[PDB]
Amino acid sequence: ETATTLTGLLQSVAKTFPSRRGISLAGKFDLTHSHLNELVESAADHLISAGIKPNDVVALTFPNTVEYVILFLAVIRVRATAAPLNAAYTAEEFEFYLSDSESKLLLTPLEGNKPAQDAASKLSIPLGSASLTKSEEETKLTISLKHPESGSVAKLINEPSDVALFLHTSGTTSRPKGVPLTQHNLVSSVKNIQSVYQLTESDSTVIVLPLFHVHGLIAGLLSSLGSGAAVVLPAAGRFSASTFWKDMIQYNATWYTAVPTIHQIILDRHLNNPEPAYPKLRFIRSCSASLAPVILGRLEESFGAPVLEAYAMTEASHLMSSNPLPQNGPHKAGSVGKPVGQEMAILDESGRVLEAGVNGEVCIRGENVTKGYKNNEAANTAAFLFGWFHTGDIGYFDSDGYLHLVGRIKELINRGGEKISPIEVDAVLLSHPDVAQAVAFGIPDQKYGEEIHCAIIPREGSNIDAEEVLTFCKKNLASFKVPKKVFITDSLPRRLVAEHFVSK
Numbered sequence: 231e232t233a234t235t236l237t238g239l240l241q242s243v244a245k246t247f248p249s250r251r252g253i254s255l256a257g258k259f260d261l262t263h264s265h266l267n268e269l270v271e272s273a274a275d276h277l278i279s280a281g282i283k284p285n286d287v288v289a290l291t292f293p294n295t296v297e298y299v300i301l302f303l304a305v306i307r308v309r310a311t312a313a314p315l316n317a318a319y320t321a322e323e324f325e326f327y328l329s330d331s332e333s334k335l336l337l338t339p340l341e342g343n344k345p346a347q348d349a350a351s352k353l354s355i356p357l358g359s360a361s362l363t364k365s366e367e368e369t370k371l372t373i374s375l376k377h378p379e380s381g382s383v384a385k386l387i388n389e390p391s392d393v394a395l396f397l398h399t400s401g402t403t404s405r406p407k408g409v410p411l412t413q414h415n416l417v418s419s420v421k422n423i424q425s426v427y428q429l430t431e432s433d434s435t436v437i438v439l440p441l442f443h444v445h446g447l448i449a450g451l452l453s454s455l456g457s458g459a460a461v462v463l464p465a466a467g468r469f470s471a472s473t474f475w476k477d478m479i480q481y482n483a484t485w486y487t488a489v490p491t492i493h494q495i496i497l498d499r500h501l502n503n504p505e506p507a508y509p510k511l512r513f514i515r516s517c518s519a520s521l522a523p524v525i526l527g528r529l530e531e532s533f534g535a536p537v538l539e540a541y542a543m544t545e546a547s548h549l550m551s552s553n554p555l556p557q558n559g560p561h562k563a564g565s566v567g568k569p570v571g572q573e574m575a576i577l578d579e580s581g582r583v584l585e586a587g588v589n590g591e592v593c594i595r596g597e598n599v600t601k602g603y604k605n606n607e608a609a610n611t612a613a614f615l616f617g618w619f620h621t622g623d624i625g626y627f628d629s630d631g632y633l634h635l636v637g638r639i640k641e642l643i644n645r646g647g648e649k650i651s652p653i654e655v656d657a658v659l660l661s662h663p664d665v666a667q668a669v670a671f672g673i674p675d676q677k678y679g680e681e682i683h684c685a686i687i688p689r690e691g692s693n694i695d696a697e698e699v700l701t702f703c704k705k706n707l708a709s710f711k712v713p714k715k716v717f718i719t720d721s722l723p724r725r726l727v728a729e730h731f732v733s734k
């Protein structure tokens with residue numbers, strides 16, 4: 231009996247392990263698989279009542295809270311599409327993402343999200359909030375609509391083809407591409423992640439990544455719940471260095487997944503403030519940005535768990551390749567391991583499958599890969615050349631078929647796992663009336679791996695400064711995307727600009 235649907239897999243988990251711990255708010259309360267399912271079903275009923283019909287996009291801007299986990303599964307449950315969005319976005323960003331995703335409802339915490347609410351208000355998109363009260367008197371997920379539609383979920387059968395998760399990604403055009411991930415895509419990816427790491431109901435983990443990115447959402451939350459394993463959300467609604475190990479120990483965690491920058495903080499936290507003992511984990515996971523072999527070495531030596539580096543992207547519904555469990559094979563530093571439940575080939579510009587050791591574009595094919603970018607035949611033409619999905623990454627296979635990432639064909643600045651389009655930031659800078667030309671570029675950074683700076687040629691006669699350019703960018707871009715330095719110059723000739731203004 232194999233699930234055709236993520237909703238169906240999670241319902242299968244509710245039935246099989248109804249009493250087992252599903253999700254917890256660290257040091258506050260625990261929800262069983264069956265209780266979470268009842269809450270998801272109740273929230274689903276409320277989304278129907280609110281007028282959410284199949285294929286409708288419901289935008290979600292929350293921290294990593296149980297409210298978000300219920301709503302997300304409830305949106306998917308009623309055959310609607312979850313469009314999670316970074317709460318840290320500007321009104322200008324929120325306006326585009328809500329607009330381009332055709333969001334017909336925005337949900338925030340009770341405190342709200344003013345930039346997101348400003349965007350929805352202007353786009354005439356209905357607003358609501360969600361709050362979970364779990365006291366001795368009641369347990370209730372209150373969905374409060376500002377514009378209520380009304381004053382059930384039996385007839386609704388989820389289909390594999392149903393778009394469940396919608397996320398934006400960057401490529402060539404300054405307008406982010408829309409990535410529709412099906413009910414079929416996510417359950418395919420959960421099986422891959424469950425398989426390679428052999429996740430079981432006895433596993434538990436602490437979420438230290440944002441649940442609006444596929445890493446935290448699919449590998450962290452959904453792959454755990456689909457496996458019947460337990461998920462623990464830190465009280466802070468985000469990664470907390472001080473509570474991390476207290477929460478891992480108290481909730482008997484067997485594994486965690488983070489990015490190198492998070493691992494770095496946890497390592498430094500082990501030097502200054504060592505725990506008396508550390509819980510023996512099955513494995514520690516790294517993804518999203520290249521893990522330095524030194525870090526991998528330190529993590530393993532410090533915590534005594536095998537560190538397994540993986541390679542994931544949104545279009546692939548997260549996981550593409552991973553180093554295996556030590557029991558199943560070796561893990562190699564500076565490698566992202568072998569493909570998992572999908573075909574992977576190294577292709578030259580002509581679509582020739584290159585032999586081992588030769589650098590080409592890493593291309594994938596599998597049930598976890600998006601049908602294609604939403605209403606964007608141009609992007610899909612290039613992205614699906616020769617019947618493979620083109621990642622935009624340059625890499626090679628060694629004799630054992632282990633992938634090594636050595637470069638990028640696409641223009642990205644990977645800032646500690648967060649993706650910054652130089653093309654999107656160029657569009658913002660060029661839009662400034664006193665800016666004539668602008669080039670946002672990437673440089674090496676000890677902490678974040680890469681960092682964004684920019685170089686500007688101002689409109690002849692204007693007296694613009696870095697402070698003006700920064701202030702303006704901060705109104706239009708999220709702080710992580712904003713260039714940290716602005717080199718105002720006379721002429722531009724990008725790799726060449728980065729080669730010029732880089733420091734020694």
Ligand SMILES: Nc1ncnc2c1ncn2[C@@H]1O[C@H](COP(=O)(O)O)[C@@H](O)[C@H]1O
Pocket residue numbers: 399444516517518519520521539540541542543544545566621622623635638644649
């Ligand atoms: N282990 C890794 N090392 C280096 N880059 C990575 C790694 N995993 C993922 N990436 C990059 O992250 C991209 C996916 O971005 P996203 O869709 O935001 O997850 C990939 O195409 C790579 O460029």
